[PDB]
Amino acid sequence: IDTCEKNSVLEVIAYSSSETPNRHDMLLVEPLNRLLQDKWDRFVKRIFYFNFFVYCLYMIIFTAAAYYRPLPPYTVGDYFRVTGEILSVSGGVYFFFRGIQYFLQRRPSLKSLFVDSYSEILFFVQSLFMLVSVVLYFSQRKEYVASMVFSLAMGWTNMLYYTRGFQQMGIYAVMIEKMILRDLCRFMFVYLVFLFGFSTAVVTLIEDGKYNSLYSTCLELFKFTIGMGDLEFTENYDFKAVFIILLLAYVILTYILLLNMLIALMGETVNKIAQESKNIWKLQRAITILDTEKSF
Amino acid sequence: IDTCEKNSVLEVIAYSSSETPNRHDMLLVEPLNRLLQDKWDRFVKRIFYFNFFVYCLYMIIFTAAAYYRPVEGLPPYKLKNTVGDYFRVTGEILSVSGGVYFFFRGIQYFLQRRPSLKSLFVDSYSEILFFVQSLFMLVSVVLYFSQRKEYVASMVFSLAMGWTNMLYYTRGFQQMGIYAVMIEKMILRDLCRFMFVYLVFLFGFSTAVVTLIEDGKYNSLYSTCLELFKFTIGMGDLEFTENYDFKAVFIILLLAYVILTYILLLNMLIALMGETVNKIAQESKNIWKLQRAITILDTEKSF
Amino acid sequence: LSCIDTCEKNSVLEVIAYSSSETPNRHDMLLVEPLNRLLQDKWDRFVKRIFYFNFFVYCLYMIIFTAAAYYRPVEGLPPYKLKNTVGDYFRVTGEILSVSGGVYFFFRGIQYFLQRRPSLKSLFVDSYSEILFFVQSLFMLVSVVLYFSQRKEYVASMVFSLAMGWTNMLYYTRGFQQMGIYAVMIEKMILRDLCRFMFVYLVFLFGFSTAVVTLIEDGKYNSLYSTCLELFKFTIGMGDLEFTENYDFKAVFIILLLAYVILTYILLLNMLIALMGETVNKIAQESKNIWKLQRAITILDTEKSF
Amino acid sequence: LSCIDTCEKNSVLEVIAYSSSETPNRHDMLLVEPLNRLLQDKWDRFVKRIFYFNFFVYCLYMIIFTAAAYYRPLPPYKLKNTVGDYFRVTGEILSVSGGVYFFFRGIQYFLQRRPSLKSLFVDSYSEILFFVQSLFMLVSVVLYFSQRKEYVASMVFSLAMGWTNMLYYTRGFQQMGIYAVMIEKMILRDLCRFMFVYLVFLFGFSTAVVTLIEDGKYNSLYSTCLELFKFTIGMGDLEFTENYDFKAVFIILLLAYVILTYILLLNMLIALMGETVNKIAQESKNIWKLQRAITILDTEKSF
Ligand SMILES: CCCCCCCCCCCCCC(=O)OC[C@@H](O)COP(=O)(O)O
Ligand code: NA
User: Fold this and answer.
1) CB of residue B256 inside a 6 A radius of ligand 1
2) Which distant-in-sequence residues (6+ apart) come within 8 Å of C260 by Cβ?
3) C-contacting residues of A 217-256, CB under 8 Å?
């Protein structure tokens, strides 16, 4: 069941592809749940806490190094800074190698890489950004800072991966995943269509000014969504009536309707997916247990 | 059942009048739903994808009116003998042809259906909106030839209305189709009710505030109404004017307005839309199924 | 129908429509078949148009009053002369009509109070519209009193009356099931959720504003009113977080502002939204029944008006 | 009621009310018929009146304290010969007296109950909050006499804490009591989870941005953190600086932060609050009843 050395039920269920109809519900059987919970507390609950603390420390060291950066390449302060930079690069390459090892070991069907285990892809992409930032730094360029800030943001965001192992916060993270995947996606598609259409209309209306550029008008229109719109950002054009009509149409369509609809849909989805989000967290904790077990 | 060429069950159900009690729920019968799904997957899916692809492409031939629109004034304009002006003119011709085609499609629908003149404005909003877009394009053309400067506004309206109309092509996918159906229900019911009440409240408080002040740039009704509306979008000032008297009265009026609209009616709208979401799931799925059925039957009749 | 419609002593429909709020389940009384069918019949026969006629005349009155108010002269030291012009004639006759309407509303309110004879304990949840209209009428009358007393406070009173008149159009939402239900939802929410949230939020606002103004030393924002307004301005999504800099202990100022923001904007407003959602999910049936009872009260009052 | 209300050694009321949180069903106990009839009898009999008097005197004390602190003049300060200065001094003396009184009441509670060092941070939030308010007041007094300006900061902290703590007296009013209990539950669960996630995201993106920014006003971590936080209150700027080498990266980072936090996390917080409110009605009523029982027992035991 758990230690077969030929084929284990735990390995089959946990490492199953998304195709399996009930890869979550079948971990709730009495013996499996009892064994998983007992193992976690026994010798995987404090192995995970140590990993989480080490990652936190690594990220602190990475932030300190990057935040204090001086045509690269470029006292006690400098020795500490270079040591931190080297340690951060050494962590990035470690994550890259772990991701490649996971890619080879699991060898996905070239379909579940895009639908399953988003954590592995995110971590590998963070490592890839860090390595690109290193090569640019050693290749006489300044885009090494853009790559590094991208990697830093992604790494800080990735700390949610460790929210698993704490029940309530694990459920919260699973809910975040579901919401982003379904509701934010639908809303963003519709809202981007609306925003682009109205921004193009307004740009066509505008005759001459600083806001002829499609980017400028799109930014100004998006400014409404964040409660910072202007509604008078420009007055260099004819037919003010048409401009105000278009602006009011956009406001009513996007701010007064789509965002409130997003709130309502989020409420409904949260009301719907409590038990599924509990089962998904349980399975995410089972995969963590088995990965920790196999890492030796 | 499906095609007797005289009066088939699917044809009558799909073209049902609004007065029919449960026009939406008829398709749920197993043979009918299984027959629509099979026919779609068999030959209508690719046709619909092609139509959406060519439609969005056709609209995009004119969404670059920014780069197109000259600024010389008093059209018509001249031809520059450059590749750029060749692209501009061919795009304009392609945008006018599209408008004429959509106008005639609407006319062909209107005549063939021969509506009883009541369900026209109650159901089938998509084709009315497409016809309005065609009308706005034709008006742009006629104004353009007539040496007038209102063609820019007329094409801008058409452009915006077409970009929003892509929401029609949103159908054909269960998730986004049902999302569009929910948007339709919400904008018809909750937005209309809230808009009526909020517009009454805003007009009242705007007239009160305008009467309060004495003179300045905000003396007009329109300007003060705009300032009061700016509270709703999260940009309210609370001190937009100084040339007045009775600061107590002005402040208390602004507070009453804010508390009554921003902190009450918007949250009421959120709650009502939430309960509507909770209530119109299966209804919104059935309506999407009926929309797909109408599209399939129209494609069949398109030969 | 004998002993149901009208007896000159007591009829069940009149009793139900005018029943005191203290009755346990006065709302469900209308649910029985004969009452529902008969009220629908009377409305569709006569009161449907009569109510629309009471919503057409009132709208005309309010438009006339607003037109008179907006075009008012600004010269000071009232009253003012009646110059020879069509505009002056029209505005003065509009003023006369508006004052007459105010007097009419004043008299109707007095008559209702004298006939119903309320206990002065049920004039908040009951006869809400009556109190609103009477207060509007009172504001108009005091406006006139100031006007002919040679005081400029008539402008303030008249603008208050105008605001109440325009916002009282919701009374006429009855006669349309969806609009009437929405209006009664507004009234219930105002009665419960707005009043609870406002009390808590006001306590928080006053506390933090007093703390901040105590911290400040001198300047424009040294007063309690200006600081209270600045703190309130966060709630409408236009906070500053840096509105003042003439003080000491920037850390304390930042801590207080962040604490206030987290406690109010992030917690209490989203809590109000959640409670409103729950209530709305809970108040459909009673909101329908209350609308039906309000409908019946309108029917009975129109019938008794003869 | 023999050995239920008064026993001098142990009774059902004093055992249930003062039961540790380790007790499984501590809340549901008071719903038993005779207990519910006895608590409501004692309350109506006298505890309502004593509680109302205590609330009124506390409100008077807080008004005095606010007035004294508002008109504050290297302390200490002398006594100017004027009525205003005498009233200020007597008011601040009264405020200090109230502070020491609350301090000693908190000490008495600690000595009496003798909690197990774990219920302190999970039970009795009100008493610890009152004690912290008193501690701030005493620290303010000692600093004031020690010739420092830090007394102003201490006293403003105490004043704000007291004003927000005034909610303690909302109990004894059913609706406001349930409201306060629900506020307590929301702060413990939803605000905590959201704050954890939001702080993680905010620090990550703020660090990224401040790393991108070359130099200027916002080259410090605190300033950039403040600017990013401003987006949460509907006051983000999106153009607050231009001192960077890559505009595309800056705009992408800001858009990602906005989408992740403002659009997503805030709306999700609203939804989670709605779910919780739907979930915790009966549990919020039971907790209010238990709070009302504790208050009744305390008032009885105070004499
Ligand atoms: C000194 C007064 C300060 C307040 C500013 C004056 C104007 C405030 C607007 C009036 C407040 C009530 C608005 C409201 O929300 O109720 C709407 C009414 O239709 C109630 O409906 P109905 O008459 O009972 O049918
Ligand atoms: Na704002």
Assistant:
1) yes
2) C204, C208, C231, C234
3) 227
- Are B276 and A253 a contacting pair at CB < 8 A? no
Cβ within 8 Å of residue A83, ≥6 positions away: none
Same domain, B122 and B156: yes
Q: Which among D70, D150, D278 has the least Cβ separation from residue C278?
A: D278
The first and second tokens of residue B45, run together, are 């899916």
Q: How many residues does chain A have?
A: 296
Q: Is residue C91 in a domain?
A: yes
| Among A163, A198, A233, residue at a domain's last position | A163
Range of the domain at A197: 179-272
The Cα C156–Cα C169 span in angstroms is 21
The count of C-alpha atoms lying within 13 angstroms of the C-alpha of B124, restricted to the half-sphere facing its C-beta, is 20
Contacts of C273 in chain A (CB under 8 A): 263
**Closest CA to ligand 1's atom 1:** C160
Is the same domain home to B191 and B272?
yes
Phi, psi dihedral angles at B206 (to 5 degrees): -65, -45
% helix, strand, coil for chain D, step of 5: 75, 0, 25
Spatial distance between the Cα atoms of C180 and C177, rounded to a whole number of angstroms: 5
Backbone phi, psi, residue D167, to 5°: -60, -20
Q: How far is the CA of C131 from the centre of ligand 1 (A)?
A: 10
- In sequence order, which residues have a C-beta less than 8 Å from that of residue B278 and are 6 or more positions away? A268, A271, C281
Examine residue A105 and state whether it is found in any structural domain, yes or no. yes
For residues D50 and D165, membership in a common domain is answered with: yes
A278 domain residue, yes or no: no
D80 Cβ contact list (under 8 Å, min separation 6): none
Number of domains in chain D: 2
Give alpha helix (H) positions in chain B: 9-14, 30-39, 45-63, 65-68, 83-113, 125-145, 151-169, 174-186, 192-212, 221-230, 247-260, 266-279, 281-302
**Does the CB atom of residue B64 touch ligand 1 within 6 A?**
no
Q: How far apart are CA B250 and CA B242, in angstroms?
A: 10
CA distance C104 to chain B (A): 21
CA angle C136, C137, C143 (to 5 degrees): 90
Torsion angle, alpha carbons of D76, D78, D84, D87, to 10: 70
C274 → closest Cβ in D149, D175, D274: D274
| Residues C40 and C149 placed together within one structural domain of the fold | yes
A270 to D268: CB separation less than 8 angstroms, yes or no: yes
Verify that C161 and C70 share a domain, yes or no: yes
Strand ranges for chain D from DSSP E: none
Residues A157 and A186 in one domain: no
Q: Does B26 map to a domain?
A: yes
Q: Alpha carbon of B293 to those of B47, B102, D238: distances in Å?
A: 14, 22, 46
Residue type, A62: F
Whether residues A156 and A65 share a domain: the answer is: yes
| Whether B162 and B237 share a structural domain | no
CA of residue A215 to ligand 2 center, whole Å: 22
User: Is the distance from the beta carbon of residue C156 to the nearest atom of ligand 1 less than 6 Å?
Assistant: no
- Characterize D144-171 residue by residue with b for buried, 16 or more Cβ atoms within 10 angstroms of its Cβ, and e for exposed: beeeeeebbbbbbbbbbbbbbbbbbbbb
- Residues 6 or more apart whose CB falls under 8 angstroms from that of B236 comprise B230, B258, B262, C236, C237, C238
Q: Do B208 and C178 touch (CB under 8 A)?
A: no
Q: How far apart are CA C182 and CA D49, in angstroms?
A: 41
Answer whether D274 touches B (CB < 8 Å).
yes
In angstroms, the separation between the Cα of residue C195 and the nearest Cα of chain B is 11
Inter-helix orientation angle D192-212/A144-157, to 10°: 170
Among B199, B195, B205, B202, which residue's Cα sits nearest to residue B269? B195
Ligand 1 and C201: CB distance under 6 A = no
Give the separation between CA C52 and CA B229, rounded to whole angstroms: 30
